[PDB]
Amino acid sequence: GMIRLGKMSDLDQILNLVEEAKELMKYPLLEHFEEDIAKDYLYVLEENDKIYGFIVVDQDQAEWYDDIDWPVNREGAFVIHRLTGSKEYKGAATELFNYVIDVVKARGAEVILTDTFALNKPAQGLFAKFGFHKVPFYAYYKNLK
Structure with a gap:
């Protein structure tokens, strides 16, 4: 409902969510966020003018994914690269x-992938919540059928 694509004007809030995450668990990412936003790959959840989380999703797969023996076909799969709440x-x-x-399912996708690094350590439970399967860090896949 008020999930929408992130815009350049949301960057300061996006960055502050990242740093808030880091502070809970204790340069180059600003450039990569700007790119995600330019490519409309980043969504934000917003109430009032305030951003309460974001997610980055696309079909670019990590070069190191090629080093894993996946049990599912990856051709055309979607990838969640980062997810943070507040x-x-x-x-x-x-x-x-x-x-x-839901959007990737609506598009006819069969597989959505991700990895341990997409989520904050304490949010790792969400992998379980959403039925992802592992393949200490892990790569995950979800069969959407």
């Missing part, structure tokens, strides 16, 4: 993850 609303992560899974 202190003020942790549930934003779940809504975003879920919104993206």
Whole structure:
């Protein structure tokens, strides 16, 4: 519902969510976020003018994915590269993850992939919540059928 694509004007909030995540668990990412936004690959969950989480999804797969013996076909698969919610609303992560899974299903996709590094350590439970399967860091896949 008010998940929408992120815009350049949302960057400061996007960055502050990243740093908020880092502070909970304790340069080059600004450039990569700008690119994600330019390519319309980043969605945000927003109420009032405030951003409560974001997610980056596309079909670019990590070069290292090629080093794994996957049990599913990857040709044309979607990939969730990063997902973050907020202190003020942790549930934003779940809504975003879920919104993206629905869009890829609607598009006829069969497989959505991701990896441990897409989520904050304490959010790792979401891999389970959404039925992803592993293939210490892990790569994950979800068969959408």
